[PDB]
Structure formats: structure tokens, C-alpha cells
Amino acid sequence: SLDFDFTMAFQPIVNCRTKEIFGYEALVRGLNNESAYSVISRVNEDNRYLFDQMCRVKAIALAAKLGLTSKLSINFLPNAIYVPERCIRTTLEAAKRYQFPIENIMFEFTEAERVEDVNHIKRIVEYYKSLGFQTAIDDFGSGYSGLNLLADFQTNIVKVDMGLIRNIHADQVRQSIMKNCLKLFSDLNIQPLAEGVESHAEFAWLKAAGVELMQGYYFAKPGFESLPSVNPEFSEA
Amino acid sequence: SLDFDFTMAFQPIVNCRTKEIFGYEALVRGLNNESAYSVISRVNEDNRYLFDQMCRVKAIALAAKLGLTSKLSINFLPNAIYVPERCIRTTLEAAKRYQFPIENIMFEFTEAERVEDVNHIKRIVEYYKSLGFQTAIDDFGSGYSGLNLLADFQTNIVKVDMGLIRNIHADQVRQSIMKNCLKLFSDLNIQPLAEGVESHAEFAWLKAAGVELMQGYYFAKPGFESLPSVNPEFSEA
Ligand SMILES: Nc1nc2c(ncn2[C@@H]2O[C@@H]3COP(=O)(O)O[C@H]4[C@@H](O)[C@H](n5cnc6c(=O)[nH]c(N)nc65)O[C@@H]4COP(=O)(O)O[C@H]3[C@H]2O)c(=O)[nH]1
Ligand SMILES: Nc1nc2c(ncn2[C@@H]2O[C@@H]3COP(=O)(O)O[C@H]4[C@@H](O)[C@H](n5cnc6c(=O)[nH]c(N)nc65)O[C@@H]4COP(=O)(O)O[C@H]3[C@H]2O)c(=O)[nH]1
Ligand SMILES: [Ca+2]
Ligand SMILES: [Ca+2]
Ligand SMILES: [Ca+2]
Ligand SMILES: [Ca+2]
């Protein structure tokens, strides 16, 4: 209730090997399903802290109410807070109140539109890992979310940007990028997740290339205040 | 026609395989060897184009005056000139007047906060290639200069950011990043160039890993209005 209100949509992440849902990404929405950008547009510098806290409690509260028993992935605001130990208490308290294990919460980090801070994000990531949270680098291969992040700290998961996934079955350059990045992730013991999968052709190439966790319209669109079920076409095909 | 004046320093790029000097990067300086940042700090949106053009002509003219016979590498300003012949003619004319071959000029592209027009950088790169210029992605593995660029267009050279090079002989994560990136560059028929090499230990790992083109204080610092000679410690053969 920081001048405005909002809620969450949820989008499944699928394990294409086991054909089970690994979890859901929480995606901020307006009360009448207005887009995430229109909500985040209302966030200013005096909002960052309070807005980020509301996102986590809303996602946890909604996911618990909806009966989510797999992972809950929450986007971490790009700049926002410096100190990592203080006001995470409200996240820990919410997780306790809704009986949602910390180990089932993943935070997605996409650096910023800022310079070579990186040591800023690193200590946040390593502190969250120390409490039991899962961590992901988001939008890998776009913007400031790249190899510079990976060089200084490693998350549990790397979500590869949809720009690199698009039409990968037909794009030899994207094929070479992904094959070498998958070997990199394997060397670093990082689990890849392909984001923005829109067609069976992308899915099949990515699955053959070794990706298991995937997300995208091909599986299910984000669901307003709900947990969407997943497309049956991928599990048989 | 600019409010201020400046000149260039030059820093050699070495080929550790052929043991020859590949070329020199031109680095903008003030008339009294003031730093590049102090010069570029005076550039605003009403300056970007003209400043970028002056840098090119000054680098070409000085390199010619100093008798440069290898490649000349020139930085392209983030969000500089427009898509087509936006007076690249003045660059062609200067190269001709100073009898500097077009194929010996390389332009370095370092993106910084471009998200919208994707073919914007691509069309400049493909047009310059069509004129005979060499092209490089600069600072690969930092800022907005990452895998997203490589996916949609490929330059002749990729300069890997010094952040990825630093202490690589002792850094297992940076070794894996570089090993897998070197294989990617080879798959894309792109020549790698390791930037910011500061010690023999970094040089030795990079050479054993297959890197040929290198740049850094280990070889020579930039020389104000001069072409520095290269470190005798490696050049003894
Ligand atoms: N073209 C395409 N898009 C797909 C596909 N599958 C999922 N998406 C969309 O792509 C975005 C993925 O989330 P994001 O990359 O982190 O990009 C997000 C995220 O960076 C930001 N953000 C969203 N929710 C939150 C939040 O709760 N807290 C914070 N701090 N930031 C958020 O807003 C961005 C947009 O989120 P959305 O509008 O929901 O758009 C979502 C999602 O709806 C696909 O197959 N094709
Ligand atoms: N720590 C370390 N640094 C090394 C080493 N070897 C070279 N360098 C420094 O790192 C910078 C390399 O150039 P840059 O990455 O493109 O980064 C440059 C470039 O982006 C920008 N710039 C410089 N000259 C020009 C120009 O003529 N035109 C445009 N548009 N930008 C320029 O200014 C940036 C800084 O230029 P400089 O002050 O000359 O700093 C140079 C260079 O002096 C090393 O071994 N260790
Ligand atoms: Ca995300
Ligand atoms: Ca994302
Ligand atoms: Ca450069
Ligand atoms: Ca550079």
C-alpha cells in the first residue's frame, strides 16, 4: 500500500526431462492485470525498498494460498538495497508465517543499468546463499547480465536470455553460443534454464543440447494470481 | 569545430604467435597528456558526432606522421554516428590523403545501454566490413558488450575485457570462461584479443590457451603521440 497496490502472476518452469514443474516465477501485475512495467513505472527511489518487500510477501503469500509446493522464484530489484543482512528479516518472517521453506525460494539477479559495481551484487548473492535461498542470474546474455557476473560469483541457476534462445534450431551462431555456454555452465556446476521458449522446434533443440529447466509461452503463459498448468504437447509430441 | 582540442596516445597490440606487432590502438589524450576520461568528459550529445570524427582523423594523421605500418585501431563512441554514410566519407578521405590503407584500420565497438534498434550496431558493422575496414567488439565480458552482440553480428576480432584476463593463471573460473569462449570464437571464425595483460603469468596462460593477439602494460603502456616499442622480456627469440 505504498501509494499504489499490485499483485502477482506466476509462470511455470518445467523440467523437460522429468516432465514435472520445477517451480513458478512470480511476475508483478496490476490489480486489473496491468503489465509489470506499468507497475514498476510507479516505483521511484523512495519506493524501491518498500516495493521490493511487498513483491516478496505478495509472492510468498499468494503462492502459499495457491498451494505451491515446488520452487518460488522472485525477481530481485536491480539496484535497490546495499546492506544485505538487515531487512531480509521481513522475507524470513513471511516465509515462516506462510510455512514456505527458504530452500524453496529462489532470487533472480539481473545486475543493473549501472557500471562495474558487481561486488555489490556478489555480497548480496553470497549472503542469500548462506541463508539457504536458491539464486539465479537472470537474462544471461543481455544487458549487464553476462560473463562479468559469472567471473566473480556463481549462482545455482543461470537463466539464459530469450534473445539467445529465439529460433535456435535454425541459427548456427546461436547454436554455437549455447553449446559453448552449456559446457561453461557444466564446468562451473551451474544449472542452465532456457527462458522465452515459444515453439516446439526451440524446445526440442534445447532439450537435445542438454537443457532441462525451461520457461516460456510454449509451456504456459503467466497466470494472473494462479498457477498455470503446462501444455501436454511437449510431454508426448 | 569543437570547444576543445586533444591528441592521441598509441598502445601496441602484439601477436605472440608470429612475434610481430599487429597494430596500435589510438587512445585519446589532452594536449598535455591529460587522461582520456577528462577529454571524453567534455563530450556531450551535441559533441558526440564531431568528436568521434576528429578522433578518427587525428589518429590517422598522427599514425601516418609517426610512420605506422601495421594496423590502427580506433574506438567508436557509444551511440556515435547514424546507420549509413553519415560522413564516413571524411574517414575515407583522410585515410586516402595520408595513404593509410583502409584494410589496416580497425574500429572498436563497445556498446553502452543500447536495447531498442538491434540491427543498428549490426548495419554499421556490416557496412564498415563492406568498405574494407576491420571491426572489433571491445570490452567483451563487461557492460552491454556480451554474447547478445555476438549472436546477431560477428566482427573480425573480439577484445576480451581485462576483468576476465586478470590473474587468469590462478583463477579456475576465469580459465573455464576463457577456455569455452576461445572455442566459441574459433567456431565463429573470430580472432580473440586479450586486453589488459599485466604480468608474465597472465601472458603465459593466455599463450598456452591459444591466444595470439594481446595488449597490456605487460607489453607496453600507451605512448603519448608516439609508438612505444614492445617489452624485451618476451621478444628475445
Ligand atoms: N516474448 C516472450 N516473453 C515471455 C515468455 N515467457 C515469459 N515471458 C515474459 O518474459 C518476462 C520474463 O520475466 P523477466 O525476464 O525477469 O522480465 C521482467 C522483470 O525483469 C520485471 N519484474 C517483473 N516482476 C517483477 C517483481 O516482482 N519484482 C522485481 N524487482 N522485478 C520484476 O519485469 C520484467 C517483465 O516481466 P513480464 O511483463 O511479466 O514478462 C515476463 C514474462 O511474462 C515467452 O515465451 N516469450
Ligand atoms: N589496468 C590496465 N589498463 C590498461 C592496460 N593496457 C591498456 N590499458 C588501459 O585500458 C584502456 C583500454 O582502452 P578501452 O578499454 O577501449 O577504454 C577507453 C575507451 O573506451 C575510451 N576512449 C579512449 N580513447 C578513445 C577515443 O579516441 N574515442 C572514443 N570514442 N573513446 C576513447 O576511454 C577508455 C579509457 O582509455 P584510457 O585512459 O587510455 O585506458 C586504456 C588503456 O590505457 C593494462 O594492462 N592494465
Ligand atoms: Ca526473472
Ligand atoms: Ca529473464
Ligand atoms: Ca578499445
Ligand atoms: Ca577495451
From TrEMBL, chains A, B:
Record keyword Kinase present: no
Molecular function via GO: cyclic-guanylate-specific phosphodiesterase activity; metal ion binding; nucleotide binding
Binding site for Ca(2+) 3: 138-139, 195
Cleavable signal peptide: none
Residues given in the record as Ca(2+) 2 binding sites: 110, 138-139
UniProt keyword list: Calcium, Metal-binding, Nucleotide-binding
Keyword Membrane attributed: no
Binding residue positions for Ca(2+) 4: 139, 142, 144
Domain of life: Bacteria
Ligand binding (Ca(2+) 1): 25, 75, 108, 138
Residues where 3',3'-c-di-GMP binds: 11, 28-29, 75, 198, 217
InterPro entries listed in its UniProt record: Cyclic-di-GMP_PDE-like, EAL_dom, EAL_sf
Protein name, UniProt field: EAL domain-containing protein
Record-listed 3',3'-cGAMP binding positions: 8, 11, 28-29, 55, 198, 217
